[PDB]
């Protein structure tokens, strides 16, 4: 039985699994008032990928395919391809193309295109509204609003690189993005399918532990806090190791290598999320060189030392 | 501890010189020019070299506060380290980790969040790594943007790379040059603490390159981007830290659908791969093929022709 373990990496050395940006800090908070069900950064401890989770960090919230537009519009419809530029399969038992955004918001990025005619290139500012009725990646279609009405060609490889999130600056619509609200992956009047399950602390006094990054904002006052259940490196590491789970709960200690002192302990659940013993919203204060260490498998009656 | 390389197909892995996925394998002659990239540099026992760091998303990014050049849409960025604490120029590395290791013009987005009340803004931005004012080792880089009024001073600012540009003409269609290092301290200075140049030493051998196509944002840039090791291999060696038992590790590229070996190659301790082939060649590989470490060999092992 191959022994289980987590990578020796500091928080800042790791990557958010829900947007291609580095981790910044750890956060814990109450989560009973809403549904926590992200589809990226979902992986079991024995290396089973869930939801829309794939291995590469750079591919989260990216799109590839060819685009079309009606005459003189700045809106382009992208017919999605799989990222290796082969055909996309809508029937495959997944919620949406692997790496698809798993929150409702406006993502701003750049739409680049290289034409096979002579190799010429071009890129323009583009925005995708993931809460739009016309956002249906599971059906293989998304729509971008851009800065051109003439420059992109049909039947040519086009890619979308995400940059950040936007907001109109006002107070009337200052509730976006909503990181815990999944899009309708197939468009209006449909239900999502093959979702990774929602998570919640069941043990009394416990809250989820979130790995937090700050999304860049390109305008106004967006919700830039972005929390994921596992760092992308853990997803990658579990997929590689595939160590059998000896129990439903793995005990992690967060250690400071400068002193060897344990700062806090936490539970890593088999299905792939972390909880701590704490009540209230809290930005954890951690030393620069700290990292997580797996110490043992425990039963389900283990009470964490308060954080 | 036994040495090994990850069970990952090429398409599942990431270029280590630009935040984009790998696409294919390429081999070619490299005696006519100097091969010395500083990103994706790692020894087999997990020691990072050059400007190489672990996260793929940080490659070719810049962080710091910006100042504005009057009578231009250009900004000077005073660099910070990735966690926004101060950057130390005295640290013995060629440049901040993740700094671009090629000469070309990179297009991306300059975003900023002001600490006064939290409002944000982003603008199209371009950095020329061959610029005289491109001096990352000194903690300064210069961006060209589409505004002259919108950014504020002493506020966290980030540059997100997207791709490379070229002016469309033939006169300057020689950029980017992926095998030409920038002058990290600005024009007419010498780089320091560089990871060494590599070359096949065994007769009949060529480097094996891990190739991606960079997004182009304008004109006809050089978009082929080759790295010596996948970012994941860097990540894996760093984690594994298996001591090298020899100077050369023999890898076989295997097709699991059939169990047959497609070709073999050398993975050198110093962190690069060579194959036995003469001439430029885009490798044809099965979708699920992967690399396998089979045994340590000496320096006199003759590879089966690829």
């Amino acid at each position, epitope marked *: 039985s191959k022994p289980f373990s987590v990578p020796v990496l500091t928080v800042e050395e790791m990557t958010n699994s829900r947007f291609p940006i580095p981790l910044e800090k750890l956060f814990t908070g109450p989560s009973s008032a809403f549904v926590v069900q992200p589809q990226n950064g979902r992986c079991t401890t024995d290396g089973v990928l869930l939801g829309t989770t794939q291995l590469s960090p750079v591919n989260i919230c990216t799109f590839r395919g060819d685009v079309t537009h009606i005459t003189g519009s700045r809106n382009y419809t992208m017919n999605l391809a799989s990222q290796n530029w082969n055909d996309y399969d809508p029937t495959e038992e997944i919620p949406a193309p692997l790496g698809t955004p798993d929150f409702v918001g406006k993502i701003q990025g750049v739409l680049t295109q290289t034409t096979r005619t*002579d*190799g010429s290139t071009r890129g323009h500012k583009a925005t995708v509204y993931t809460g739009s009725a016309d956002f249906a990646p599971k059906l293989g279609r998304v729509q971008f609003e851009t800065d051109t009405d*003439r420059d992109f060609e049909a039947n040519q490889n086009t890619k979308f690189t995400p940059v950040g999130v936007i907001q109109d600056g006002g107070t009337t619509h200052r509730n976006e993005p909503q990181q815990w609200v999944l899009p309708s992956y197939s468009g209006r009047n449909t239900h999502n399918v093959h979702l990774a399950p929602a998570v919640a602390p069941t043990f009394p006094g416990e809250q989820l532990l979130f790995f937090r990054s700050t999304m860049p904002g390109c305008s106004g006052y967006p919700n830039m806090d972005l929390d994921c259940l596992l760092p992308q490196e853990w997803v990658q590491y579990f997929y590689q190791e595939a160590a059998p789970a000896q129990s439903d709960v793995a005990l992690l200690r967060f250690v400071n290598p400068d002193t060897g002192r344990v700062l806090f302990e936490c539970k890593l659940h088999k299905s792939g999320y972390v909880t701590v013993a704490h009540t209230g919203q809290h930005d954890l204060v951690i030393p620069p060189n700290g990292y997580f260490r797996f110490d043992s498998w425990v039963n389900q009656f283990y009470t964490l030392a308060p954080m | 501890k036994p040495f090994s390389v990850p069970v990952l197909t090429v398409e599942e892995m990431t270029n280590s010189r630009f935040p984009i996925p790998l696409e294919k394998l390429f081999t070619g002659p490299s*005696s006519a020019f100097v091969v010395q990239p500083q990103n994706g540099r790692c020894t087999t026992d997990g020691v990072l070299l050059g400007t190489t760091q672990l996260s793929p998303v940080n490659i070719c990014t810049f962080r710091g506060d910006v100042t504005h050049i009057t009578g231009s849409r250009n900004y000077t960025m005073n660099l910070a380290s990735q966690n926004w604490n101060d950057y130390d120029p005295t640290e013995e590395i060629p440049a901040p980790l993740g700094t671009p290791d090629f000469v070309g013009k990179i297009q991306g987005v300059l975003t900023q969040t002001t600490r006064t009340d939290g409002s944000t803004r982003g603008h199209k931005a371009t950095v020329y790594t061959g610029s005289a004012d491109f001096a990352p080792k000194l903690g300064r880089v210069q961006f060209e943007t589409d505004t002259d009024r919108d950014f504020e001073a002493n506020q966290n600012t980030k540059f997100t790379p997207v791709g490379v540009i070229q002016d*469309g*003409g*033939t006169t300057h*269609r020689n950029e980017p040059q992926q095998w030409v290092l920038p002058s990290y301290s600005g024009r007419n200075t010498h780089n320091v603490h560089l990871a060494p140049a590599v070359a096949p030493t065994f007769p009949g051998e060529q480097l094996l390159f891990f190739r991606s196509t960079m997004p182009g944002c304008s004109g006809y840039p050089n978009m082929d981007l080759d790295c010596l090791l996948p970012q994941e291999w860097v990540q894996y060696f760093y984690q594994e830290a298996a001591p090298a038992q020899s100077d050369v590790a023999l890898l076989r590229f295997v097709n699991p659908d059939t169990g047959r070996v497609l070709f073999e190659c050398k993975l050198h301790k110093s962190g690069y791969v060579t194959v036995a082939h003469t001439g*430029q060649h885009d490798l044809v590989i099965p979708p699920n093929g992967y690399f396998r470490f089979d045994s340590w060999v000496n320096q006199f092992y003759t590879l089966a022709p690829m």
Partner: antibody
Amino acid sequence: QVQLQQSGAELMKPGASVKISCTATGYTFITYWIQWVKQRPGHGLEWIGETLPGSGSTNYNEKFKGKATFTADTSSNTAYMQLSSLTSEDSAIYYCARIGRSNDYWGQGTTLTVSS
Amino acid sequence: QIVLTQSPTIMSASPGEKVTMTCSASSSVDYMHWYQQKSGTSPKRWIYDTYKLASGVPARFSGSGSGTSYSLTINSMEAEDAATYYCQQWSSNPLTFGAGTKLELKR
């Protein structure tokens, strides 16, 4: 996808100036550079220069700086090259070309003959 | 300027022969490109970035080289291939072509 149409054959006396037309269809004209190339029977291909129509941007081969002038009429999608002070060594086939990375688009060519 | 010297200036081949023509540069270049031209028609970009094939170019063609020495190769000559081939360079302005290699057919 692109087509370049050039003006007809020209026959000029020495010392005159000729203006050759290159009309581009199939793309946004002011977005691509036009290259101009000279071809003499025993002298292979020679690059005159390039220009980006509607903008001031031009790059001349030093040998032709002062001989060839590039202008454009963007309304009409036409690029022009003017050659001044014609001598017999200007007798050649002249091409306009949109030269890309992987493929090109060349005009059909314009034959110029200079003679007394 | 970068002078490209092609060799041979003219040659002939039987259908099926292996054909090789070379380009030598006065200075180093990063990529070499090749053009095909037939009598009465404009030049067509044949090989670009040293080894990559342009549109419509048969798999029997190939290119190789680095620094100052490059070559174009046809593993099996066909009648369709009889034409004149020019090599071409971008590394230094001005852009330059070689004088050309005239390929004729044997019979």
